[PDB]
Amino acid sequence: VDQRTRDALQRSVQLAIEITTNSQEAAAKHEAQRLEQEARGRLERQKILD
Amino acid sequence: QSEAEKARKELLELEALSMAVESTGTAKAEAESRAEAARIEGEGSVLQAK
């Protein structure tokens, strides 16, 4: 019935959204860091084979 | 680093053949020069003493 309760429920969803945007940005960063290491693993091995 | 180490053992054992050359060749050169100069002095001394 009260509107101020509906506001308190409105900020509840603004958080729920930011929780999924933070999860793709953390899941992207973990894939960036994994590939950046797969190159370094080869670039460092290639210098030694030269 | 286990991969950049199985190859680095190969880089190391080739440097051991190479460092053999730089050392046995340098000492072979400075010693055969002294042996040749002392042979000229030695064959001349026989004539000079004659």
Curated annotation (Swiss-Prot), chain A:
Induction: Up-regulated by IFNG/IFN-gamma.
Superkingdom as given in the UniProt entry: Eukaryota
Record note on quaternary structure: The vault ribonucleoprotein particle is a huge (400 A x 670 A) cage structure of 12.9 MDa. It consists of a dimer of half-vaults, with each half-vault comprising 39 identical major vault protein (MVP) chains, PARP4 and one or more vault RNAs (vRNAs). Interacts with TEP1. Interacts with PTEN and activated MAPK1. The phosphorylated protein interacts with the SH2 domains of PTPN11 and SRC. Interacts with APEX1. May interact with ZNF540.
Intrachain S-S bonds: none
Post-translational modification: Phosphorylated on Tyr residues after EGF stimulation. Dephosphorylated by PTPN11.
Tissue: Present in most normal tissues. Higher expression observed in epithelial cells with secretory and excretory functions, as well as in cells chronically exposed to xenobiotics, such as bronchial cells and cells lining the intestine. Overexpressed in many multidrug-resistant cancer cells.
Domain note: MVP 3 mediates interaction with PTEN. MVP 4 mediates interaction with PARP4.
Location of the protein in the cell: Cytoplasm; Nucleus, Nuclear pore complex; Cytoplasm, Perinuclear region
Taxonomic path: Eukaryota, Metazoa, Chordata, Craniata, Vertebrata
Protein name: Major vault protein
Function: Required for normal vault structure. Vaults are multi-subunit structures that may act as scaffolds for proteins involved in signal transduction. Vaults may also play a role in nucleo-cytoplasmic transport. Down-regulates IFNG-mediated STAT1 signaling and subsequent activation of JAK. Down-regulates SRC activity and signaling through MAP kinases.
